[PDB]
Structure 1
């Protein structure tokens, strides 16, 4: 029995906001879990500390699945990004604890190593095509096997994924949401040239990816996928908002460009139709926003029955605690596809010391017991919360749209 004696929520902003749950057991074994929900951080803080945490106290930390079900079913209102992110933080901390008790890295509990390391993709961006390709050349030189390309839309002042930051992209940049303007036509007429040029310069062995970031309708995404077929993308991501899962049927009927979706998904139900009808090739859902290792492991098993591989999201708003958890998960499944890896700031790496390392285009979680990560509370305390929002996006006529 590993009785839980304390559970605390820590908020810090070492370059951007992160929320972390730290659980302590009676004999001093601790675990951490990430609870960061970009642009709505404090709602999760409250969901944990005002509501979930009081029920953790006195529970046996060994009971991972029962605690998971207790919170998932016990909340009454079911799922949603706030609830599932809070649950993720508990789940990650409990797996961390399990590994420490077992004297083993978490991946050893989930099936053991299925690969030598975890292949990542990097984030090339620029205002013009030549700018983006110059960045991609850099990522290839740095040993990346896979690279996402995003580029400015001619005739629009701003677009998703293009900024002054080059090893990462940090869009939550203002204390009220930054407003953008969008034209779908300007984008559809321009973005295929990016991938034509990329293949001319970079060749055909490197994997190339693209995030549409929710801006198309299915018949538009069908067209974009066809236009991109000649360049053999690894995936085309989040092409259309996915609440209507049948929306992907039209895409799938018209293009063979592989499809990815799901960084925002909170539970299996957000992907069930997509997976069961073979409408996607990669599921982007994460241990952070879809309810932890416990839940993502179940989802991955279901995905593997339908040729779906994992392509976990990995933007900066997933802390090093999520990255550790994601790497243990990624190491231990047959149907791993790719792992996104945006670099954290040096201050973030200092606040969350961790065992995972990057070499030759792959991450590896290390072999420390548990997750192989912790939070330095003293350093965390030196970086207070700073309100910061994700941007919003409107059409040319002012219509509220999807960023």
Structure 2
């Protein structure tokens, strides 16, 4: 009976823009029980939608939803063309939806299914950003009042019009995919390297040593430049220095690790354990940032987290607005169970987004609390979602001062 009940009756995607674009996969079993999974890939959303709609969804009909592992392998190996952002996001969406269903069928919140809670709450960090160091400091003050124990700090660089994590116009909400076609930013590494240490010095001067302070380099340096920055910020004891260098070549982290004791984080642009196996095994990083939606879902990320744990590496899930509350809820469940949890990024969604994706995770005093509802605790209001049609938005590109297409 349970098998017939777990047979997939229907599966389909939902595309909505309640503040920004989200793509969601819904899987409905013969029992009526459904699961949903995040399928949002910022700036390439419709590639994943088509991957799902045309190629994956039709193969899901009639399958046993209880066979999570088999389905993961069927889609991963069966695609023939393996790994990649579009590929692994589609697989993650299916996987997340199937774990949602399994937890509902078991009558348990997801964290219970994974092995139970390892912690009573989930520490987060907030994005503190400003045009000037002082503007950023004001935001740090604000978030400490909200109870955040950890903050990521980003401020504008003098001589540079636009830099990562800083809004074009003060007060306004930072949402990077801000244009139909990519905005074009200009970059100077040398000016940034001379300025960045001043920001952390100021944070420590005003806020002291107890605050966890994070910084995202956002792919812009070469290894020896990142080594230099790491050394320069050692006195400020950062929680992490993130995305120092593009790391398709994983050996790129070696020179940084050999030259600094500033902790390193990487991985939000990764989608496979094969993108980071060497980074982990060689102890070149301290935190792995690959999130559920882009990293092949729960099934794959359990394996990544477990590999990390052998080398003292901790989880630091990417948590921007462009991963939906479906991912965030599942992530908080995962974060609640995983032994080697590090931190959870929190970039709050719009009220409109929260309304479209009702959920039972809570934020209190700087931390997340996992929901107790069976499933990952998130759902989608299809009627409300239909009120916000897709609107194309691309991520910016970054060029050097001479026009060289660089890393954003």
TM-score, length of structure 2 as denominator length = 0.98
Asked whether the equivalents of residues 266 and 290 of structure 1 are also in contact (C-alpha less than 8 Å), the reply is yes
Q: How do 1:182-331 residues align onto structure 2 when only pairs under 5 Å count? A: 182-331=187-336
Aligned residue for 1:66?
A: 70
Displacement of 1:168: 5.9
1:401 counterpart (382, 399, 406) = 406
Query: CA deviation digits over 1:236-265, x for unaligned, max 9?
Result: 000000111111110011000000000011
Aligned residue for 1:173?
A: 178
Say if 2:99 is the partner of 1:95: yes
Aligned residue for 1:349?
A: 354
Aligned residue for 2:392?
A: 387
Displacement of 1:169: 2.7
Asked whether the equivalents of residues 9 and 49 of structure 1 are also in contact (C-alpha less than 8 Å), the reply is yes
Q: How do 1:140-159 residues align onto structure 2 when only pairs under 5 Å count? A: 140-159=144-163
Asked whether the equivalents of residues 125 and 166 of structure 1 are also in contact (C-alpha less than 8 Å), the reply is no
Aligned residue for 1:137?
A: 141
Asked whether the equivalents of residues 308 and 335 of structure 1 are also in contact (C-alpha less than 8 Å), the reply is yes
SS in 1 for 2:202: helix
Change (3 A) 1:284 1:168: farther
Change (3 A) 1:116 1:351: same
Q: How do 1:6-17 residues align onto structure 2 when only pairs under 5 Å count? A: 6-17=10-21
Displacement of 1:364: 1.4
Say if 2:117 is the partner of 1:113: yes
Query: CA deviation digits over 1:360-385, x for unaligned, max 9?
Result: 11101210000111100000000000
Aligned residue for 1:46?
A: 50
Asked whether the equivalents of residues 14 and 23 of structure 2 are also in contact (C-alpha less than 8 Å), the reply is yes
Displacement of 1:113: 0.4
Asked whether the equivalents of residues 223 and 256 of structure 2 are also in contact (C-alpha less than 8 Å), the reply is yes
Displacement of 1:165: 7.1
Query: CA deviation digits over 1:156-192, x for unaligned, max 9?
Result: 1110000147696310000110000000000000010
Which consecutive aligned stretches of 4+ in structure 1 deviate over 3 angstroms post-superposition?
A: 164-168
Change (3 A) 1:220 1:42: same
Change (3 A) 1:167 1:263: farther
Say if 2:86 is the partner of 1:82: yes
Deviates more, 1:167-176 or 1:6-15: 167-176
SS in 1 for 2:93: helix
Query: CA deviation digits over 1:193-233, x for unaligned, max 9?
Result: 00001001111111000000000000000000000000000
Change (3 A) 1:301 1:167: farther
What CA distance in whole angstroms lies between the structure 2 residues aligned with 1:117 and 1:202?
24
What CA distance in whole angstroms lies between the structure 1 residues aligned with 2:270 and 2:162?
26
Asked whether the equivalents of residues 315 and 342 of structure 2 are also in contact (C-alpha less than 8 Å), the reply is yes
SS in 1 for 2:250: coil
What CA distance in whole angstroms lies between the structure 1 residues aligned with 2:278 and 2:146?
38
What CA distance in whole angstroms lies between the structure 2 residues aligned with 1:300 and 1:366?
21
Asked whether the equivalents of residues 124 and 166 of structure 1 are also in contact (C-alpha less than 8 Å), the reply is no
Query: CA deviation digits over 1:90-136, x for unaligned, max 9?
Result: 00000000010000001001010000111000000001101101110
Asked whether the equivalents of residues 399 and 407 of structure 2 are also in contact (C-alpha less than 8 Å), the reply is yes
Query: CA deviation digits over 1:260-297, x for unaligned, max 9?
Result: 00001110010011000000000000111010011000
Asked whether the equivalents of residues 130 and 170 of structure 2 are also in contact (C-alpha less than 8 Å), the reply is no
Query: CA deviation digits over 1:28-47, x for unaligned, max 9?
Result: 00000000000000000000
SS in 2 for 1:52: helix
Gaps of 5+ in 2: none
Displacement of 1:393: 0.4
Asked whether the equivalents of residues 168 and 342 of structure 1 are also in contact (C-alpha less than 8 Å), the reply is no
Cα RMSD after superposing both structures: 0.9
TM-score, length of structure 1 as denominator length = 0.99
How many residue pairs match? The answer is 403
